[PDB]
Amino acid sequence: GAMAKPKTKLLEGGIIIEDRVTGKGPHAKKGTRVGMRYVGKLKNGKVFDKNTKGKPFVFKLGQGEVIKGWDIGVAGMAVGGERRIVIPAPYAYGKQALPGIPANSELTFDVKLVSMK
Template identity: 50%
Template sequence: MKRTSILFAILCAAAGLAQAQQPTQQEPAPAPQAEAAAPAKSEPIVPGSAQPGPAAEQLIVTDNKIGKGAEATVGATVYMHYTGWLYRPLAKNQRGRQFDSSLPRGEPLDFKLGSGKVIKGWDQGIVGMKVGGKRTLIIPAELAYGARAMGGIPANSALIFDVELMDVK
């Protein structure tokens, strides 16, 4: 790995903690229902006052562009560009506050797919992509960081990522 990002470090730490604390499950537990809808605008996160957004009930994978290159399979090293936001279904494009992106760094994130080095929503949502493909992943809290707050991400937050598969090795 040439460079690590804040998100990659967070993803690694979260994946390691999740594996150590919970037994592996085939089916993710359904997310709790949100009691109130999120506001239509993004709100700044003030330390100590962050509230989780509405729940996403399951991993939602949307192909925005189908790639034509090699396919991402479990065990392969994938090279991904990404941008991550808090999931806010009533906000423009369902995106709340952006918390990380590989694009300004200019170098994709690389990791071994299916090895638990990233959040479960990524390990599940990237399988089957082809190089050149672009996807949007809406990830429920259970497949992200769960009940733990992580950096600027409140506990029990659903996330949304735009990902692009740059290479597979």
């Protein structure tokens, strides 16, 4: 019985986090090596990135090759928990119009933490 508030919550900027699975474990801070699995969708439901089937992605917070929505939204993540993260444009690519992902793009990330070292 722990109240982590399984609803939508607001982080820096306008980042929304929806805690899908009740996860209580090691918290992810900067310098921490977290291993996760995720599905990267656009606001329209267009999936551009994905790793689920036996594919662990391991990265540490504090690095500069992940968008700030990640380094911030992942901060305080727990192994065993899943959360759908809504990342507004300012904390991702912002004003860069990529093929398929134009400026003012709202990314939706289905992410769950499954490891930490």
